[PDB]
Amino acid sequence: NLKDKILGVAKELFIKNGYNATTTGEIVKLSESSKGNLYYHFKTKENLFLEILNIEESKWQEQWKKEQIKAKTNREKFYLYNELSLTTEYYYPLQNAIIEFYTEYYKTNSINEKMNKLENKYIDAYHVIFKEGNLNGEWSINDVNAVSKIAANAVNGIVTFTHEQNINERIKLMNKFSQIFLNGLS
């Protein structure tokens, strides 16, 4: 495909190289497309990267549902969710491009005007595991929406900041956290 081969090279590029490293034209380069082709299908290079994000945030979000069954209670759901984060082939990999990019276009408004959309689209997995855990009476989270953002960013931290050490340790550290956290809640 045309437009489905652009995202195809852009994704990986942002990852390998970072947000700035990859260029509006460099993509058009390894994708064989016409510099113009971009404009009507993809507004700006930041719109394309803003696009790929929602795809990844989606791909993962689905893969998550299809697996979370293996977790019967939500307490397990919570552990499982965080565990799987470390291993998914989605979103999480291009997490520095996220950093680079928010600290680079943060002096504009098209940011929080298309960012928080993805933020909320993310802290949502935690929204449901907690709120559900209230219904199931697995605990009493009085400000769920908050706890969701904490948990999600504390977790995004453990995943992003340890990427380069033995995967069985990340999984160990991550479980010990999932624990301490759930624990401080009840």
Ligand X SMILES: CN(C)c1ccc(C(=C2C=CC(=[N+](C)C)C=C2)c2ccccc2)cc1
Could you tell me which residues come within 8 angstroms of residue 82 by beta carbon, excluding any fewer than 6 positions away? 155, 158, 174, 175, 177, 178
User: Per CB under 8 A, does 26 bind its own copies?
Assistant: no
CA distance 42 to 50: 10
**Nearest residue (CB) to ligand X, 39 versus 161:** 161
Cβ contact 134:141 at 8 Å: yes
Looking at 70, 89, 102, 136, which residue binds its own copies (CB under 8 A)? 102
Tell me the closest approach of the beta carbon of residue 186 to its own copies, in angstroms.
Answer: 8
- The span of 21-29, 70-78, 149-157, 164-172 binding ligand X (CB under 6 A) equals 149-157
Whole-number minimum distance, CB 123 to ligand X, in Å?
5
Q: How far is the CB of 52 from ligand X (least distance, A)?
A: 12
For ligand X, the binding residues (CB under 6 A) are: 60, 85, 88-89, 92, 98-99, 102, 119, 122-123, 152-153, 156, 160-161
